[PDB]
Design a protein around this nucleic acid. Structure first.
Ligand code: NA
Ligand code: NA
Lengths: 94, 110
DNA sequence: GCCGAATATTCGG
DNA sequence: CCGAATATTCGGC
């Protein structure tokens, strides 16, 4: 399992980051709140960059899709589900 | 991909700058003839120069890029009988004073 | 918003 | 030193 997916699983699931990135209440997706602060303050703790665009490129690379005031966004993957970490084994690049 | 109008990869301008910088010459510097550069104390160079220009502090990842762009280690014949107890790299188009040749250095494809 | 491609970083042969 | 896996960046719809 590539490092991006386990890092993404960790930082989404981490309660200490939920004001910036967190599971949706139903758990099929995750929200990103205040993309400016998230990109500069959260991304460099896990990756070699602080660009939201490079984070989104990786999401799309593994097949995540954007879910249709604040600068907030939401992404989903059919196999990126809260509580089901094992599904990551079969998430490959498209 | 790269720019449509003009392309000099970031590694080459960064390499030119950090080699030519007099503030780094105790760690990386041009040879006297200007046709190669030396790396002194690879450990200190990796911690002190590499993170200022790249997303890492690994000598191996710096050398990987050097080889990707066609640079080769310079080796020297050992003369004399006295025992002798620090590396050097060259590219035919990486020459001090012939700065425009840097533009003709292309990365390997893979 | 999503994907192709060149370059960058890491890991193993 | 090299090839590949993965990551980061650049630019096209
Ligand atoms: Na979180
Ligand atoms: Na120097």
């Amino acid at each position: 399992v590539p490092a991006f997916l386990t890092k993404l699983w960790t930082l989404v699931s981490d309660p200490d980051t939920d004001a910036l990135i967190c599971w949706s209440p139903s758990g099929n997706s995750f929200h990103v709140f205040d993309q400016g602060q998230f990109a500069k303050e959260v991304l460099p703790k896990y990756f070699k960059h602080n660009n939201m665009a490079s984070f989104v490129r990786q999401l799309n690379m593994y097949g995540f899709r954007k879910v249709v005031e604040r600068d907030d966004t939401e992404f989903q993957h059919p196999c990126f589900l809260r509580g089901q970490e094992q599904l990551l084994e079969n998430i490959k690049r498209k």
